[PDB]
Each structure stands twice: as C-alpha cells, then as structure tokens.
Amino acid sequence: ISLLDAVDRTSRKAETSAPERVRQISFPMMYFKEVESITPDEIQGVRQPGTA
Amino acid sequence: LTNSEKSRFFLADLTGEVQSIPNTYGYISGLGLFRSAPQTQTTFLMDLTDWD
C-alpha cells in the first residue's frame, strides 16, 4: 500500500492501486535409515555382567 | 557352569569329579584267628610244662 496524493476538484483526476503478487515454492525432505542384526554367537556361552 | 578357560566372561560346565581311592587288603584280619587278651602290665609270662 502507498500514501494518497491530493488532486483538484474540477480536474476530475484520481489515482489507482497496483495489484498483488503471487509466487510458489517447493520443498525436498530428509531420509535416515538404521540397520541392526542379531546372531546366536552373541548369546552362546556368554556370561551376564554383574552375575557369577 | 563355573567359568571358561582363560576368560572370565564365558562359561563351561564342571560335569564332575573322578575319585581314585587306594586298595586295601583284609583277608587275614577277616579270618578272625587271634583272640583279644587285654592286660594291665607291659610284659607277661607263661609256664611251659611237659611230662614226657
């Protein structure tokens, strides 16, 4: 918006207003993966810490 | 389940003991030939008599 400007009463002149402005945007996203595995070698004959 | 060899974090099984006892003989003592003769002195005497 702008500020109005004084004009004369008989010249009949006036002033108008400018239109708006529209734009568009896009967005890419982020991907994360985690992998694990379980093997019997981790359990076979292994003492539990803190136990005899 | 006591412990592994050369590691304190694994377990092995103490299956058991194998006792190996010495052998003793008791045939003569089992025959029961000798008669107990308790006494108070440290020495004793006997008489030997023969009509012949």
A47 contact B CB<8A: yes
Question: Position B14: which residue type?
Answer: L
B12 contacts in chain A (CB < 8 Å): 45
Q: What is the resolution of this structure in A?
A: 3.1
Say yes or no for a CB contact (<8 Å) between A47 and B10: yes
Counts for chain B of helices (H) and strands (E), in that order: 1, 0
Task: Look at A47 and B9 and tell me if their CB atoms are within 8 Å.
Answer: yes
Which structural technique was applied? cryo-EM
A38, with CB counted inside 10 A (0-12, 13-18, 19+), is exposed
Nearest CA in chain A to B10: A46
Q: How many residues are recorded in chain A?
A: 52
Q: How far apart are CA B9 and CA A44, in angstroms?
A: 11
